[PDB]
Amino acid sequence: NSVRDAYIADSHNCVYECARNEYCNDLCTKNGAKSGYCQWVGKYGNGCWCIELPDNVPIRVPGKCH
């Protein structure tokens, strides 16, 4: 598939921390996702989670934020 649900990440494999769900919905949708929300707890801790984020945008993968 060309989309996936995951933490959106930058070019350094770092999540985007969040204080508001709105921040994440905006961030996710402007990058092509259908919606998003803030995770205050999750696999990698605090960060925005996007629904159906296209695969030309990075997601947090195993390893470190560098």
- CA gap 61, 14 in Å, rounded: 9
3-state helix, strand, coil in the chain (%, to 5): 15, 35, 50
Give the domain extent around 54: 1-66
State the structure-solving technique. X-ray
Provide the CATH number for the domain around residue 18: 3.30.30.10
* Residue 8 near residue 17, CB atoms below 8 Å: no
Distance, C-alpha 32 to centroid of its chain: 11
**N-terminal to C-terminal alpha carbon distance within the chain:** 27
Kindly state the DSSP code that residue 58 receives in the 8-state scheme.
-
Resolution (A): 1.2
Please name the helix (run of DSSP H) or strand (run of DSSP E) that holds residue 30, with its range, or none.
helix 21-30
- In the chain, the number of structural domains is 1
- CA gap 10, 1 in Å, rounded: 21
Locate 50 and state its tokens.
């996007």
Locate 7 and state its tokens.
């933490």
Residue with tokens 């995770």: 39
